[PDB]
């Protein structure tokens, strides 16, 4: 005796974390599937068009299958007043049958968005799929490192800005290495450096560049700043690279990362379907919601789960930079 | 012989005071209830999701009940020309049956907004619920200090910017204390310092920071300034904290407060229902309005009341800073 | 044989002079009445709400009546081609029956707006109602000084910026005097100084403040500048007061005025009805328009009139400052 | 056998040249007439309203008639595929019956806009109506100088910025002369100086003002710049006058003009009707278009013409300034 | 047994590369035709209007025909789940029948946009039509140089900014040469210099102009920057010319180009129809899409092709500048 209420999940769309705002994981490179196994094709080849004749026809991608981790947050009790989920029809919406549903959906979306932000930051920073048990111990049968998955390796770096010299030389060399790795595409938009607030301050005021960054600060001139105005982050552009001060808190100090934006199919995502006998071999809606009124004779629960995974197919283009303060 | 006209309250929505613009008390963390007693749950725990299996289930909040203070401003006399509250139907709206109603509603909303701003500023500054009699004497049976309510304590500070040194060190230490208090969440957006105009000027031009704040003033670069453009306040960002010059007038001189923005469920609010035999155990519309035409044989009155309360559940994260000029 | 065409007055709304843009006289504090006598209530008291009980009830304004000056500009002749005022119906609008009406209405609105701007500037500057005969001689039976009307007095000042010292000290003292006059309200938004271009230049570049105003000019940072972008005025903020360079031309040189913005009911206005046997004891539409086709056998006229008045109820808060160059 | 297609002219409205963007010749002071002779009334008098009584009534413009020059650009051949001007009905619009019509209309509008910009620049600069034959020789029977038309004279000037001193003194004196000429109106908005790029550079960097214009350049602070953002011109404000660098190309070097903006009825325009037996004593649509399919047995032509004229009624307020580099 | 699905191409419009954003190749100067041969008319003459009489009538363009290169990217296999191209009707859209189609269309549009950007950059930089075989060898029977096509020649330049002097003198001389080439039109908007990032940095910080470009950087003041805010490029204006730092990657280092914007008919484009027996002598939709379900008994393919060409009719106005670092 379970009734589905997944459609109401759209009544309050999630927010957009800093990575989503930067466009690293957007709604474009994210597809909904109908199986627990998700296909990701890392197409690194040429699809160039060329001139042909009026007749004569004329016109090999490594893809991998993984298991999408399951994460239910079904912990929820219906208060028998929040049983106003019998919406639409004729309803009594006003505020009584609208605001309660909106608040419940907003709470669920906040929890799901926190989980998804954790997944995305794990994919970008640790270069692996997030999958952990209740105790906080990684499930090695689901946490698959991308480098060891695609048969590829990632770049590194080592900079200490306290002593002397301009650190941006290493960043430029990494830029040349990355663009050589892209080769026949070279389709990056900008070079961003996700750095902590302390690292940003340390690298922004050292005497080699302490004048240009402070005296000649081009406020509201950077493309990211103009495209932002929804977050209070601080940016600085120099030597063809941009320093971005992440303020989410998940960026551990002493570890800044530099990577390009705009490379197609570099970052992907998926929304596997929910575990059920009715939702098997059926397309997924992303975040689910079921109202169970037969699990317990005393209270009815609101079961909610989300299946989601991320990877960096072109993981070779990420510079796992290390800073020292 | 009383007819209700609460629905017309929406014809002129209230303004948004500085606290509402900053997002401290917004329409999100504010719910309408159907009883004089309001429930507030200070959930400070972990609701993290984790990986599970295809089967096996897998998935303690202190809440307190208070009395919502009642505040009627029913003082109002119908002029027998402002008896045009027989709107809609066919009406004669034009200006005669529209502008009078709009002006009356705007006046009532202005009074209610002043009262609500007083409530919110009392909750933030004095860390207690505002409840006073006609003489201006606190009703101790309703004014419940939040610290002594949740079994929690608040932080303090002591800075004199007239002599020397950079005051922001104390602010940074308080920031670390607050983020340690949040612990496993650390989900603050920015560190704002509600300071008076005199305190702002004193702390902005002392010679330790007199150059950066004046010469290197990043006008229209702060997130608050970009998100504002509806108030003429002045802001300054330094050392990872923002100085905000409140211009509402309710911020007494010599007492600036520093607190974080964005912490979920830290600030809440409620709208208890109106005292009546028809509005008991019925959801509330916020601000009410009744037209009484039998109270006095001579004149008819316009009774209006609003029930409203605020608290700071995570009161431990507020730094009750003290400044000296 | 007269047909009314007052409704077409809305086809081209008036502009907004500098005072209207600043919000001194807006559409909020302006009401339409149905008599030649207008009521203005200077409520300077407390309407504060307070806590009460579930039962027990719980909950003197000087208002004055004046005569609204009448001002007809009925001088107008119908060209017998501008007799296309038989609009709507089926019409022939295209451009023939639309642009002629629009141009006539725009001309009438321009004249009325000039008159109304004169009324508003007289109310603010000379602190009296504008009422003059054809020769330009004041009608003392209608020109009622606000100070001698409300039983109140206004403030003054005296500053010469040519010699030395910072003039803003006098402005600050006047600010304290005004806020003391408001007392239990203190609800001003900003301190604006309506000053002429010559006075603005004289007070902006004297050596005491010649550096901050020029070198440290916070362009596009003032609230008025951000809220403007529809006028080319120049502003400067210092010592908690703003210097505004009026460019309307009605501000005589050597006389700058400082007054607060946002004080409720300080500035009011009214639109008395037109003088007629059909428009007596009838609500007013503001600006009227009648087509008279029986006044003269040769030509038909377009009679237009507007009744309008302004006052400063809280006149005690205006600083009639005097400058010397 | 001619069918009219004037209505399709609105499918692609013209652009707005620099003069139109500045508001010198806008859609407000431009009326459509029904005769080859156009009436322009230079009303320089007082229409001020004044107080009157409840009864007693209470309440000479030089206008000139000119011939509107005719300018046909009927040179056009229908390709028998651009015979898709049988639009609407049921059509086949898609792209075939839409884009061809749009391109033809855009071409015609571009030619007409070039002609109209020439007319407007001739009216402003040479202070005469543009009317020339095919050879480029002025038709003295239509080119009527405005000064010799209204019985008025225009101002002049003489400045050489290469040597020394501040040129703006002459501009200020001309400003006082102009405002004295306006007298009882004085309703100008700003003092603009249409100057060439070379003249702008010469007058902007001479050592008397080389510091303020370069070091203290108030970028995006001028009213014109904020109201622009559709043209890449450069502006500078000083001494109550604005220097505007025209980039249209029709401003000959060594001749900059200073004139006020906002003066009512100073600049006017007209759209006389097309020369035909069906369009005589009929209101005009501005730019016409006729499809003639009987003029030539071989090809059908697309006849298009526009009648248009401009004048400066208050020509006495224009300073025909002369610069020397 | 082939069904056409060209209409769905509009479900996801292409992006706009840097050249399209600058307006070099926009949707205005781009027409859809119905033959493999495209007509381009380089009209460099006078179409000026002039005054005429009420009667008397009053009122030679080199055009060339080329073959539009054909470029199919028909390489595509239907997954038998992406056979949801039976959209509309009643459908099951939700996400299943919407997102798959949207993703396929977005992929096809991305490939086509890359091809079209290559065509446009070849037309602008190499001044020839792009046409190459699979091996990447130019088809000389389709690659027609514009100079040798129109009987015209292009300009050149030679600047080395490393040594001394101001390079902008050569740019100014080229500007005068170009405007002399335009002659009786002179209708350019701005002088842009498409330069690489390295060339931009080299030419922006050399000591002759190292101060104005850095100290006096007019951020957000250039017209291109205001009209942009969709790309993170950097611009600088000096001596009446603008330096633009292209970041697309197709601009080879050591070769910057200066050319004017706004010249009518200088840049054109075309969309020839698809090669088929049903799409011959039929207007073109730009990018096509056909679903072939009889080509192979095993899998069905998604055939897609685009015919497209560009030229610079007024090629004489482009300065093929050469830089040296």
Closest to A206 in 3D by CA, of A255, A239, A163, A157: A163
Give the separation between CA E216 and CA D219, rounded to whole angstroms.
11
Residue D34 CA to its chain's centroid (Å): 21
Q: Could you tell me if E281 and E275 are in contact, meaning their C-beta atoms sit under 8 angstroms apart?
A: no
Resolution (A): 3.4
Q: Could you tell me if C313 and C40 are in contact, meaning their C-beta atoms sit under 8 angstroms apart?
A: yes
Give the separation between CA B169 and CA B150, rounded to whole angstroms.
29
Closest to A305 in 3D by CA, of A287, A291, A280, A292: A287
| Dihedral-angle region of residue C155 (phi above 0 means left; psi in -120 to 50 means alpha; beta otherwise) | beta
Question: Closest to E95 (Cβ–Cβ): which among A28, A216, A283?
Answer: A283
Which residues on adjacent β-strands are paired with residue B72? B305
CA distances from C92 to C88, C98, E150 (A): 9, 9, 52
Name, in order, each residue with C-beta under 8 angstroms of C164's C-beta and a sequence gap of 6 or more.
Answer: C208
In A, which residues are within 8 Å of B285 by CB distance? 95
Q: What is the DSSP string of C250-308?
A: -S-TT--EEEES--TTSEEEEEPPPSSSSSTTS---SB--EEESSS-SS--EEE-EEE-
Method: cryo-EM
Question: Closest to E223 (Cβ–Cβ): which among D103, D139, D232?
Answer: D232
- Which residue blocks in chain B are alpha helix, DSSP H? 18-22, 98-125, 146-150, 168-182, 197-204, 210-214, 223-227
First to last CA, chain D: 60
In D, which residues are within 8 Å of E58 by CB distance? 72, 74, 134
Angle, CA A301 vertex, CA A297 and CA A305 arms, to 5° = 145
Give the separation between CA E76 and CA A4, rounded to whole angstroms.
38
Question: Closest to D31 (Cβ–Cβ): which among C103, C114, C220?
Answer: C103
The CA distance from C60 to the nearest CA of chain B, in Å, is 12
Give the separation between CA E128 and CA E41, rounded to whole angstroms.
17
Closest to C208 in 3D by CA, of C253, C157, C158, C159: C159
The CA distance from B292 to the nearest CA of chain A, in Å, is 25
Angle, CA B225 vertex, CA B221 and CA B230 arms, to 5° = 150
Environment class of residue B298 by beta-carbon count within 10 Å: exposed (0-12), middle (13-18) or buried (19+)? Answer: exposed
The CA distance from D77 to the nearest CA of chain C, in Å, is 30
For residue E262, give both structure tokens.
């706004």
Name, in order, each residue with C-beta under 8 angstroms of D54's C-beta and a sequence gap of 6 or more.
Answer: C70, C275
Which of E101, E131, E202, E232 is the best substitution to test chain A (most A C-beta atoms within 10 A)? E232
From start to end of D108-164, where are the E strands?
A: 155-156, 159-160
| Dihedral-angle region of residue E317 (phi above 0 means left; psi in -120 to 50 means alpha; beta otherwise) | alpha
Which of D18, D232, D276 is the best substitution to test chain E (most E C-beta atoms within 10 A)? D232
In E, which residues are within 8 Å of A9 by CB distance? none
Q: What is the DSSP string of A199-242?
A: HHHHHHSSTTTHHHHHTT--TTTSHHHHH--SS---EEEETTEE
Which residues on adjacent β-strands are paired with residue C145? C128
Question: Among all residues of chain E, which has the CA nearest to that of D307?
Answer: E51
With an 8 Å Cβ cutoff, are A232 and B218 in contact? no
Using a CB–CB cut-off of 8 Å, the residues of E that contact A are 69-75, 94-96, 99, 103, 106, 110-111, 114-115, 131-134, 136, 139, 142, 197, 214-215, 217, 219-220, 229, 231-232, 247, 249, 275, 306
Instruction: Tell me the residue length of chain C.
Output: 325
In A, which residues are within 8 Å of B54 by CB distance? 70, 275
Give the separation between CA D249 and CA D89, rounded to whole angstroms.
44
With an 8 Å Cβ cutoff, are B217 and C219 in contact? no
Give the separation between CA C241 and CA C235, rounded to whole angstroms.
10
Instruction: Tell me the residue length of chain B.
Output: 325
With an 8 Å Cβ cutoff, are B70 and C47 in contact? no
Question: Closest to D214 (Cβ–Cβ): which among E28, E190, E216?
Answer: E216
Give the separation between CA C73 and CA D46, rounded to whole angstroms.
12
Question: Closest to C59 (Cβ–Cβ): which among B74, B99, B132?
Answer: B74
Closest to E22 in 3D by CA, of E220, E216, E206, E235: E235
What phi and psi values does residue D270 have, to the nearest 5 degrees?
Answer: -155, 160
Question: Closest to A70 (Cβ–Cβ): which among B52, B218, B226?
Answer: B52
Give the separation between CA D235 and CA D255, rounded to whole angstroms.
17
Q: What is the dihedral of CA D194, D197, D198, D204, to 10 degrees?
A: 80
Using a CB–CB cut-off of 8 Å, the residues of C that contact D are 69-75, 94-96, 99, 103, 106, 110-111, 114-115, 131-134, 136, 139, 142, 197, 214-215, 217, 219-220, 229, 231-232, 247, 249, 275, 306
Give the separation between CA C318 and CA B248, rounded to whole angstroms.
20
Question: Closest to D70 (Cβ–Cβ): which among E47, E52, E220?
Answer: E52
The CA distance from D260 to the nearest CA of chain C, in Å, is 13
Using a CB–CB cut-off of 8 Å, the residues of A that contact B are 69-75, 94-96, 99, 103, 106, 110-111, 114-115, 131-134, 136, 139, 142, 197, 214-215, 217, 219-220, 229, 231-232, 247, 249, 275, 306
Q: What is the dihedral of CA C156, C160, C166, C167, to 10 degrees?
A: 20
Closest to D280 in 3D by CA, of E54, C81, C97: E54
With an 8 Å Cβ cutoff, are A71 and B52 in contact? yes
Check contact B-A (3+ Cβ pairs < 8 Å). Answer: yes
CA distances from C160 to C164, C195, C205, C239, C321 (A): 8, 14, 13, 18, 11
Give the separation between CA E20 and CA E18, rounded to whole angstroms.
5
Closest to E242 in 3D by CA, of D227, E254, E228: E228
From start to end of chain D, where are the E strands?
A: 2-4, 31-32, 37-42, 62-67, 70-72, 155-156, 159-160, 191-195, 235-238, 241-245, 257-260, 267-271, 290-292, 301-303, 305-307, 309-312, 319-320, 323-324
Which of A50, A55, A242 is the best substitution to test chain E (most E C-beta atoms within 10 A)? A50
What is the arrangement of strands in the sheet containing E301-303, beginning at the earlier edge strand? E2-4, E290-292, E301-303
Four-residue CA torsion sign, B160, B162, B164, B167: positive
CA atoms within 13 A on the CB side of D151: 4
The CA distance from B251 to the nearest CA of chain C, in Å, is 12
In C, which residues are within 8 Å of B249 by CB distance? 186-187
For residue E218, give both structure tokens.
């007019």
Closest to B254 in 3D by CA, of B203, B320, B198: B198
Q: Radius of gyration (Cα) for chain C, nearest Å?
A: 23
Chains with 3 or more CB pairs closer than 8 angstroms to D? C, E
- Which residue blocks in B126-161 are alpha helix, DSSP H? 146-150
Q: Which residue has the tokens 């230079």?
A: D42
Closest to E24 in 3D by CA, of E314, E322, E233: E314
Which residues on adjacent β-strands are paired with residue A305? A72
Closest to D149 in 3D by CA, of D319, D309, D2: D309
Angle, CA D102 vertex, CA D98 and CA D103 arms, to 5° = 120
Q: CB atoms < 10 A from the CB of C246, how many? A: 22
């Amino acid at each position: 005796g379970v009734v589905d209420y997944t459609s109401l999940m759209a009544l309050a769309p999630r927010s957009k974390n800093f990575l989503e705002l930067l466009g690293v994981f957007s709604e474009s490179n994210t597809r909904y599937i109908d199986s627990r196994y998700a296909e990701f094709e890392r197409e690194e080849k040429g699809v160039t068009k060329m001139n042909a004749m009026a007749r004569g026809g004329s016109r090999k991608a490594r893809k991998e299958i993984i298991e999408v981790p399951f994460a239910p947050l079904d912990g929820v009790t219906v208060a028998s007043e929040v049983e106003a989920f019998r919406q639409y029809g004729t309803e009594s919406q006003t505020a009584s049958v609208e605001a309660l549903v909106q608040r419940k959906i907003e709470h669920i979306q906040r929890s799901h968005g926190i989980y998804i932000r954790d997944c995305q930051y794990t994919a970008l920073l640790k270069d692996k799929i997030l999958a952990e048990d209740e105790d906080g111990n990684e499930i090695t049968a689901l946490a698959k490192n991308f480098s060891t998955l695609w048969g590829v390796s990632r770049k590194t770096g080592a900079i200490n800005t306290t002593t002397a010299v301009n650190p941006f030389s290493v960043l430029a060399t990494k830029r040349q290495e990355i663009i050589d790795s892209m080769g026949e595409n070279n389709g990056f938009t900008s070079m961003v450096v996700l750095c902590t607030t302390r690292d940003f301050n340390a690298i922004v005021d050292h005497p080699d560049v302490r004048a240009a960054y402070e005296g000649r600060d081009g406020g509201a001139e950077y493309l990211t700043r103009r495209l932002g105005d929804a977050v209070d982050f601080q940016v600085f552009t120099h030597k063809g690279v941009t320093l971005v001060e992440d303020t989410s808190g998940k960026l551990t100090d002493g570890s800044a990362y530099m990577f390009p934006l705009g490379v197609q199919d570099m970052f992907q995502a998926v929304y596997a379907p929910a575990d059920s006998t009715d939702h098997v071999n059926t397309i997924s809606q992303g975040s689910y919601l079921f109202l169970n009124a037969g699990e317990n004779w005393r209270r009815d629960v609101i079961e909610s789960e989300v299946s989601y995974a991320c990877m960096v197919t072109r993981s070779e283009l990420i510079c796992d930079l290390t800073i020292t303060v």
